Design a binder for this molecule. Sequence first.
Ligand SMILES: [Zn+2]
Lengths: 40, 129, 117, 52, 67, 236, 50, 41
Amino acid sequence: NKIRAELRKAKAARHHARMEQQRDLLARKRQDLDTRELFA
Amino acid sequence: RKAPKSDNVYLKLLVKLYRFLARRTEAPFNKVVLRRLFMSRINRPPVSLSRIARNLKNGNEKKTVVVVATVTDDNRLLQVPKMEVAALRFTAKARARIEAAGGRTLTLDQLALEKPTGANTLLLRGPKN
Amino acid sequence: HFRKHWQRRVRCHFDQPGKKVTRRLARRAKAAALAPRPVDKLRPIVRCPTVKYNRRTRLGRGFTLEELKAAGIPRLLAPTIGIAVDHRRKNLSEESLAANVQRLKDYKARLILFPRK
Amino acid sequence: IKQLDAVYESKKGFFLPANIVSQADLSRLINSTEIQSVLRAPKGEARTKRAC
Amino acid sequence: SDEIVWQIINQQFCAFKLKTTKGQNFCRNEYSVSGLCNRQSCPLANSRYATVRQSPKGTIYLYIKTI
Amino acid sequence: EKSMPFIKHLASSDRKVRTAALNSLHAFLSARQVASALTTLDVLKLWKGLFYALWMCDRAIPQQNLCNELADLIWQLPRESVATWLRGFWATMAREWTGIDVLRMEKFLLLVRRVLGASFKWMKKGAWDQSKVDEVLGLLAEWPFSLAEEVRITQSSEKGGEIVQKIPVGMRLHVLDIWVDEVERVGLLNEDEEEARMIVQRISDMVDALEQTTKSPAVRTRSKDSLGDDRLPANR
Amino acid sequence: RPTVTVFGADGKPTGATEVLPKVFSAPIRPDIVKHVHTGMAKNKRQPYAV
Amino acid sequence: NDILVPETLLKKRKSQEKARAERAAALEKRKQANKEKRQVI
RNA sequence: GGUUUUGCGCGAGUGUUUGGGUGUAAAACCCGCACGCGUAAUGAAAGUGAACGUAGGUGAGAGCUUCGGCGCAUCAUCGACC
Ligand SMILES: [Zn+2]
């Protein structure tokens, strides 16, 4: 039962790590002379 | 070879440019760039900012780093130094990080524009397989 | 895995835009029937059971009796104003109970009720 | 036109591509002062005379 | 974009092209000096171009196009 | 800030509209107080507008006339703003050098030659004002004959950002090819005038230092040829 | 070119001009246009069978 | 109204003058050298 | 359903088209949440978990060079760590 529990915990941890990676990617993507304004 | 395998008209324009440079100039830089342009994609592996910075660490700074490939941003590299990078294609993240660091993103046509003989240049390749 | 007669048991999807427009017409017909009312009933905020999806929340089946009583909406009158009621669910947590109470209060504050006949 | 601007900035996950060539004029690229200066002397002509 | 338009007009399609089995391709554009579709004379790929044409009135004119 | 609505009509596609916008800019440049208050950002917008106006100019003779007028505006601007005018011109040229196809490249090179000659013949009065000579030579030392690769525009503070502009080897080669012709046209190649001799000697030292310090073989060879031109006092 | 002129109902310029978007400076790739066009033309089809 | 010669054509003409001078010098040298070659053979 | 190669797009991320919005209506355009593969491995398992050295040196090595010297990819050896 501990074997099965650690398997389930590992799967959940992998999914959570993927979600955190997506959040980190979102954060990273968050981090007058131009023609469109001068000739507007 | 005889004809580029790529179907990109701009890649063929670059091929014409570097054929002319290789024929009318004794530059091994121009010759190797022409051969690498003739190369296929899997024979042109992408290079990373971590790789180019690790090659730039020594006194080779202020040399224009030249790679005929896609320059990809590497999340592992935390700080990007100032550098002038000229490559076939730049990913959006890589170009943005280079510009934020203060470097200069160049194309191969402007590379030939500035230094036709590849003076003060640092040639890099990607990892094979 | 083609041991059996997939020739006799292959079914295609050439009617995808037809089913899409049929579903749109069906929801439009429901809207025409319930012209001022919303097309779908209000549903509570519940949590995904399994450990892999604990931190995420979704929509439930219906609101709890305790949540309805706390929000001040009668059980027999909530379905008539468009609130799904689930007698099987239990709160088991003040956090979820308060979240659903806040949702029901927002529904009350955004709802306009007409006076019968 | 004013809405082409808005929609092409509004499309998520897509950016206006950066082209591999900056100066599209290959005639500019070849017949330029820097290139013509850096080139070496020609080894012949377009049409070569027959020797023997 | 003269090289790009030349590539598009020579490698893909040309509404003024009449390719023959006799080894020469003809250009139907009324402002082409030569009757052959080639890089030197293409009115579309050569932004700066010149042509000579005759009016119905017997008068001859020269035409200039610039980028 | 400054209200300058004529740049749009300068970039417009009608020759009459562009001429009217150029005359409006003539009146603007004549207006001394605004000319005294011209900043670097302002001169950058004006020279961008004139760059696109020349870009839109079609025929050879109109192009020559427009280039002459663009060169002649310098005597119209005041003393305290001539330096800003030339610096903004050369910043615009360095920013837009590579984007020009050959057909408009000839006329832009003619404009560069004309403006360089205009600066040299505005250097005039010692029969040559040393302040003007110093300004022009400082300009030539910074943009044309640079010991570095980039030019720093604006200053760094809480009220301003950054302009780093690289100097094109093409503009370097052109100035190395036309400075001898322009000094001959303006009259610094007279051996009697000691002031002229000192000025041309300073220019020769500038291009020579460029010859030893540069890292572009094209720049090296073309500077050597420019120094080897037989019309210079040294090689004669 | 920075701007383009606007023409009135009579075919003569109104006098107003508008800035061209960057989609008109975007690169031209006939090969990709070809591939997407064949994909779309096949995407419009309806099936047939005996 | 004389239509000045383009700057690129000026550069071409200077380069062509240099090329003609080089060609003339080389041709004269080859003439002389061929003379001594004929004598020695 | 697998696999090799060419081209193309993006790129440590990528795939709109289950579906929803939209429409000049089986077209075209749009995307909110998931999901598929990949971006760290090993051990039968408990589980543990990738820097001592410019992520190491030495020698080649394309290429650049102020001719003093710098050295891509990769290989062989001696290393370091999990
Ligand atoms: Zn044709």
